[PDB]
Write a protein that binds this DNA or RNA. Structure first.
Length: 434
RNA sequence: AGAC
């Protein structure tokens, strides 16, 4: 019933064939019933996996993650969640899709949350149908979904720093382990400890994934030590997961600044994705998930919820209507719809700051709502002293567009612009006008 | 930390 103007949530457990089996079945039916359809992948890596499953079916890939020959007659488009939301913020022709399919519809990136709000609103207006696919539908707080094989779940004291004794079960194990850590720095410490104990370790994060993930498929390894990059798009031939049950997330303090808070407890959805790396083979019983604490009861602290509202308040629907967040996650923010709707010129600035500046949503919003123009970078240098950005333990400096060397000290502090080397490099280029 |  794809023509029915309703939202279907497909709760598809890890390993149940969401991409390899269910998605092609949906897409074939959409094509046969001549429905203009958009497929929303959470990441480039997942978009490339979808192309393998959809090979032969006529799909227009709107991502450079895939390069196949298009016929020009395709009625099914595929793009990443954030591409979709970005396109909604531009004064562009928003195509009139009859059917929206979102894979990994638990994803709490602010563009993903915004996309679900836009899509569910369109469905509630009678304008479209949608399908949301995930192991953990928004609203559901279960960390232990079904699996292809039974998983032994055991809560234990999980080491979170290098250890010299007291965790023998970690290194006495004869199988292969995927270990989820909150940060790159924390994983480097655990990995070094394991390597000293004689184990073969591969480390995964956003920065290293392209090169290192392939090694997990082609080299022998004992441990994969990974951030939450491996919650989506990543599968392993493993027998055990060790889970800190911790992550780092951006949090807005006092409405005034953003910190990268934590390590803090992961959500149920993320814990389910982490556990879901094992128990995948019905012919390989006995896989184990060893976890270190509870999941987050509260989630409303994360900045992504307010950021999603900032995006949605600035996406034009016909006649200036504003979309709501998807209902099961609408209570995660306490703001009235339209609070963050910017007037025309400031809205253009906000959009440009995000798309060309690569600024976080919250930061882009502060600058745009201040009346600052996109190209005026004075604000990067005129904050209070406690906003001075440090690099190698001394104040970071930039050569500006005006040929002066100035200390980086932004008027609004968002820790995401300087929390790793790539982010700081980008923000320095921004501050320089380059 | 993740993301286009």
């Amino acid at each position: 019933m794809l023509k029915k103007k309703q939202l279907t949530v497909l709760d598809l457990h890890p390993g149940a064939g969401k991409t390899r089996r269910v998605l092609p079945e949906i897409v074939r039916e959409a094509i046969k019933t001549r429905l203009r359809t958009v497929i929303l992948a959470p990441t480039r890596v997942v978009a490339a996996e979808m192309e393998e499953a959809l090979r032969g079916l006529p799909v227009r890939y709107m991502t450079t993650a895939v390069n196949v020959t298009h016929s020009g007659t395709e009625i099914v488009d595929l793009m990443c969640h954030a591409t979709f939301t970005s396109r909604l913020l531009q004064p562009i022709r928003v195509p009139n899709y009859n059917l929206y399919i979102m894979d990994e519809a638990h994803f709490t990136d602010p563009s993903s949350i915004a996309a679900r709000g836009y899509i569910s609103t369109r469905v509630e207006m009678g304008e479209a149908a949608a399908i949301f696919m995930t192991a953990t539908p928004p609203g559901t707080r279960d960390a232990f979904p079904d699996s292809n094989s039974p998983i032994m779940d055991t809560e234990v004291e999980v080491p979170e720093r290098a250890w010299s004794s007291g965790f023998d079960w970690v290194t006495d194990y004869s199988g292969k382990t995927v270990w989820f850590v909150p940060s790159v720095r924390n994983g480097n410490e655990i990995a070094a400890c394991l390597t000293k104990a004689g184990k073969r370790v591969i480390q995964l994060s956003r920065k290293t994934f392209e090169t290192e993930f392939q090694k997990t498929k082609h080299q022998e390894w004992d441990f994969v030590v990974t951030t939450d990059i491996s919650e989506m798009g990543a599968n392993f031939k493993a027998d055990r997961v060790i889970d800190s049950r911790r992550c780092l997330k951006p949090v807005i303090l006092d409405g005034e600044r953003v910190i990268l808070a934590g390590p803090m407890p992961v959500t149920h959805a993320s814990a389910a994705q982490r556990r879901g790396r094992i128990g995948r083979n019905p012919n390989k019983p006995g896989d184990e998930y060893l976890y270190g604490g509870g999941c987050a009861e509260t989630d409303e602290d994360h900045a992504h919820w307010l950021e999603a509202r900032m995006l949605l308040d600035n996406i034009y629907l016909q006649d200036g209507l504003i979309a709501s967040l998807y209902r099961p996650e609408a209570d995660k923010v306490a703001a009235i719809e339209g609070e963050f709707k910017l007037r025309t010129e400031q809205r253009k600035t906000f959009v440009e700051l995000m798309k060309r500046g690569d600024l976080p949503v919250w930061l882009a919003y502060q600058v745009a709502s201040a009346g600052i123009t996109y190209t005026d970078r004075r604000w990067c240098f005129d904050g209070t002293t406690n906003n001075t950005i440090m690099e190698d333990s001394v104040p970071a400096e930039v050569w500006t567009r005006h040929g002066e060397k100035r200390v980086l000290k932004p008027r609004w502090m968002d820790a995401r612009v300087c929390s790793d080397h790539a982010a700081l490099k980008s923000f320095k280029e921004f501050a320089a006008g380059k």
